[PDB]
Design a protein around this ligand. Structure first.
Ligand code: BTN
Ligand code: BTN
Lengths: 121, 114
């Protein structure tokens, strides 16, 4: 359960190198900070707030791509589930990125799997 | 600040945008064939200019669908109409195990809930 995650910060990285730090409360809110490091994308290396909801093993969270350091005129939402892989827990997700193309507004699809990262010294 | 929306499926939401770009409200699901219909669910999200993403976990203690959905899109001003064009994913327990369904919703701006 994402309850296991409650009342503590926990960190998570995806295969494109992005990290998020997330707080899950007992009310099922998700708060955190999202550092994007995926190539081909604006808004990298700078923390973006994030908010979402957890229900048991499922989660969905949201980021708007403005934090005052960089604005990419866009937003992303992710939806997925926690699962145990080997003996790591990860979060499997599909995501959409809504942004301003030059042909017009577009919405790009993709997938991201986040691995739990324990705190390091 | 506060506004109501209905999508092609008859589903309804109310959203407040605060001074930090947070979205808050509730979502009432009316899409045929789905769980968790006709019952308020918490909604949270973020906005950025004309773009937005929001999230719901389908759990309220009246009905838990073991389930969560995220939407991402943009508002556009279609004359008298304002719309939110979205794509969504719904992650849920399927028969094989956990799974993720894709779909799309256009939300029409509701002036005064008719
Ligand atoms: O380029 C932008 O408009 C904002 C950054 C985009 C980041 C996307 S969102 C989904 C995918 N997962 C990531 O960690 N980064 C990309
Ligand atoms: O059946 C469930 O697991 C909960 C109901 C989910 C309703 C989906 S979410 C996306 C689409 N838009 C809606 O207003 N309803 C469906």
């Amino acid at each position: 359960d994402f309850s296991s995650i409650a009342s503590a910060s926990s960190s998570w990285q995806n295969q494109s190198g992005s990290t998020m730090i997330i707080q899950v409360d007992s009310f099922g809110n998700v708060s955190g900070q999202y550092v994007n490091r995926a190539q081909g994308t604006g808004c990298q290396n700078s923390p973006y707030p994030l908010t979402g909801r957890v229900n048991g093993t499922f989660i969905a969270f949201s980021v708007g791509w403005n934090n005052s350091t960089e604005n990419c005129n866009s937003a992303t939402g992710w939806t997925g589930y926690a699962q145990v892989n080997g003996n790591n827990t990860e979060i499997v997700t599909s995501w959409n990125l809504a942004y301003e193309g030059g042909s017009g507004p577009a919405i790009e699809q993709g997938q991201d799997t986040f691995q739990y990262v324990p705190t390091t010294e």
